């Protein structure tokens, strides 16, 4: 579940934020521990 | 992290060449539908 | 070559309007935008807002409902009015001339630019001190 | 904001900084404030300057990345003692209404 | 065989949207364009366009452009990859289109002329 927000751009009302800044959890090499990483996705790769 | 400016990816087509090519296409299409007829294009109207 | 004359009593009881008028002498009110700046101790001078040519002024988000601006054509002057003033807004006021700015970095047809305003002629400033006594 | 005290030896250049570098195309503003006299602008664009003010001052052009807005004072003069304030216009991160952290320049 | 059914007729007040569903199975759904034919009482058949479920292609008539949406839904799981549902949403209808709607189709490899037809959803406006 990507906890995600809007890029802090100078957008207008019509010009939607075409980059969504999403942060989430992932499993590293050590199977016991889980890390939190962030990335950027285009608007057509996330559904609510 | 996105560095620098944020813009919208875009395409350009040279107007004179495009208009002349569409004129040629109209000329050749008018042969298969009779000489005196009207042709008007319109963008795609749906789908994925 | 315009001299901006700031007339203001500089004293207003708490919870009342603080009104000052920057009268225009050298030029006409419809030559460039008019903006206002407030300097207070503890922070740098703040760009509190501006007035558009068509009277469509803009204010800072912090004090959008606390301060008001007006422009009159019969008398060449601009008017600023604080609403429900407290003891923390005392200091110095400047009425300044501002010019339109248009720097382009993307493609105009798709927007992608910003309108920046700057300063080229300032007033000599006025001192306002608001307190109970 | 904070009146940080920076002094420059006469005859040598000085470099003043404005904090909180942005991450896009910029339009920089740089104003001065001298006690007892009317404040006036110094820089209105990175490589464009107003008339009347002598050539001694200049600003950093942020056309390449990593070039923070640094105010260069070349051939300093005893009359340069003032307060220097920055008003940053920034593209990605939103409009900065309040001027940036100021500096106090004094001549030694 | 060639199984095709309809759903969602009825009577509606002017100014509302009529949804008509046509659900098809018994054949691979990728091909075989759906053809949406409207039949108005007292007159011969009229055609209001067709849809292609490969990519939701549409091709309307000279009258309905701006009033119709020929949407589709494929099968998500490969368990039953040949269960298709073509939806037609009609909007802002005038009082003069009380009719019956059929979702016809065509032969193997082509689209003209129609062989199979549907029982037909009847729509009336009040
Ligand atoms: C598909 O088609 C679309 C059609 O729309 C294309 O879209 C266009 O895309 C381009 C870029 O891809 C965009 O370019 C920007 O344009 C804006 C708007 O300026 C326009 O108008 C100017 C008018 O200037 C007047 O004075 C000049 C003197 O300088 C004079 O020469 C001129 O005749 C005129 O009288 C034009 O000059 C300007 O052309 C510019 O284009 C060159 C592109 O690389 C540029 O390098 C040249 O200098 C030339 O001036 C344009 O037509 C420009 O403002 C913008 O350039 C500024 O912003 C960038 C990004 O930050 C910056 O790097 C530049 O250096 C420049 O910023 C200068 O000015 C700032 C003012 O505050 C200053 O702060 C900066 O520090 C910098 O100042 C210094 O600059 C140079 C750098 O070396 C230095 O030498 C100077 O001395 C100075 O100190 C962009 O160029 C178009 O806007 C856009 N739309 C249109 C309608 O064109 C699309 O590209 C196509 N795509 C494909 C794939 O085909
Ligand atoms: C093909 O070209 C036509 C040219 O008209 C495009 O029609 C226009 O499409 C836009 C965006 O879909 C419509 O704007 C929308 O209008 C509705 C009004 O109900 C509003 O609710 C939306 O918020 C949006 O503003 C515009 O009205 C429409 N114009 C007409 C005359 O139909 C069409 O979108 C193009 N299609 C493609 C796939 O490029
Ligand atoms: C995407 O969200 C993350 C949240 O973790 C941002 O990361 C921090 O963002 C703040 C806000 O400016 C910075 O002060 C921190 O330095 C950032 N931390 C790290 C480790 O990067 C991230 O900046 C956001 N992305 C964008 C483009 O703003
Ligand atoms: C990533 O994992 C961490 C913990 O491993 C999550 O932190 C907590 O997650 C629980 C859900 O199990 C929430 O109820 C808590 O509210 C979370 N803590 C905080 C401080 O929010 C975290 O939510 C996961 N997701 C992300 C994006 O970090
Ligand atoms: C970001 O995009 C969303 C899209 O729904 C929009 O609602 C929001 O106002 C934008 N800005 C922020 C700061 O979330
Ligand atoms: C396109 O080319 C034809 C060639 O005859 C010309 O008549 C027409 O004016 C052109 N259209 C435009 C928009 O230039």
PDB file of N, CA, C and O in Angstrom, chain B residues 40 45-48, chain E residues 55-56 58 60 72:
ATOM      1  N   UNK B  40     -13.992  15.968 -44.579  1.00  0.00           N
ATOM      2  CA  UNK B  40     -13.565  16.621 -43.350  1.00  0.00           C
ATOM      3  C   UNK B  40     -13.101  15.579 -42.342  1.00  0.00           C
ATOM      4  O   UNK B  40     -13.804  14.601 -42.073  1.00  0.00           O
ATOM      5  N   UNK B  45     -12.637   9.217 -31.606  1.00  0.00           N
ATOM      6  CA  UNK B  45     -13.844   9.447 -30.821  1.00  0.00           C
ATOM      7  C   UNK B  45     -14.073   8.348 -29.792  1.00  0.00           C
ATOM      8  O   UNK B  45     -15.209   7.943 -29.536  1.00  0.00           O
ATOM      9  N   UNK B  46     -13.004   7.847 -29.182  1.00  0.00           N
ATOM     10  CA  UNK B  46     -13.165   6.886 -28.109  1.00  0.00           C
ATOM     11  C   UNK B  46     -12.163   5.753 -28.113  1.00  0.00           C
ATOM     12  O   UNK B  46     -11.274   5.698 -28.968  1.00  0.00           O
ATOM     13  N   UNK B  47     -12.301   4.840 -27.160  1.00  0.00           N
ATOM     14  CA  UNK B  47     -11.427   3.691 -27.044  1.00  0.00           C
ATOM     15  C   UNK B  47     -10.438   3.843 -25.900  1.00  0.00           C
ATOM     16  O   UNK B  47     -10.450   4.815 -25.143  1.00  0.00           O
ATOM     17  N   UNK B  48      -9.576   2.834 -25.790  1.00  0.00           N
ATOM     18  CA  UNK B  48      -8.522   2.823 -24.789  1.00  0.00           C
ATOM     19  C   UNK B  48      -7.575   4.005 -24.990  1.00  0.00           C
ATOM     20  O   UNK B  48      -7.628   4.722 -25.987  1.00  0.00           O
TER      21      UNK B  48
ATOM     22  N   UNK E  55      -9.796  -3.102 -28.757  1.00  0.00           N
ATOM     23  CA  UNK E  55      -9.302  -1.908 -28.088  1.00  0.00           C
ATOM     24  C   UNK E  55     -10.418  -0.897 -27.854  1.00  0.00           C
ATOM     25  O   UNK E  55     -10.142   0.303 -27.724  1.00  0.00           O
ATOM     26  N   UNK E  56     -11.666  -1.351 -27.802  1.00  0.00           N
ATOM     27  CA  UNK E  56     -12.790  -0.452 -27.653  1.00  0.00           C
ATOM     28  C   UNK E  56     -12.955   0.534 -28.784  1.00  0.00           C
ATOM     29  O   UNK E  56     -13.398   1.661 -28.546  1.00  0.00           O
ATOM     30  N   UNK E  58     -14.673   2.501 -31.755  1.00  0.00           N
ATOM     31  CA  UNK E  58     -16.059   2.857 -32.011  1.00  0.00           C
ATOM     32  C   UNK E  58     -16.148   3.487 -33.393  1.00  0.00           C
ATOM     33  O   UNK E  58     -15.167   4.002 -33.934  1.00  0.00           O
ATOM     34  N   UNK E  60     -19.430   5.646 -35.121  1.00  0.00           N
ATOM     35  CA  UNK E  60     -20.807   6.075 -34.935  1.00  0.00           C
ATOM     36  C   UNK E  60     -21.464   6.357 -36.284  1.00  0.00           C
ATOM     37  O   UNK E  60     -20.920   6.053 -37.348  1.00  0.00           O
ATOM     38  N   UNK E  72     -16.984  -1.137 -23.285  1.00  0.00           N
ATOM     39  CA  UNK E  72     -16.891  -2.587 -23.227  1.00  0.00           C
ATOM     40  C   UNK E  72     -16.292  -3.021 -21.899  1.00  0.00           C
ATOM     41  O   UNK E  72     -15.750  -2.215 -21.139  1.00  0.00           O
TER      42      UNK E  72
END
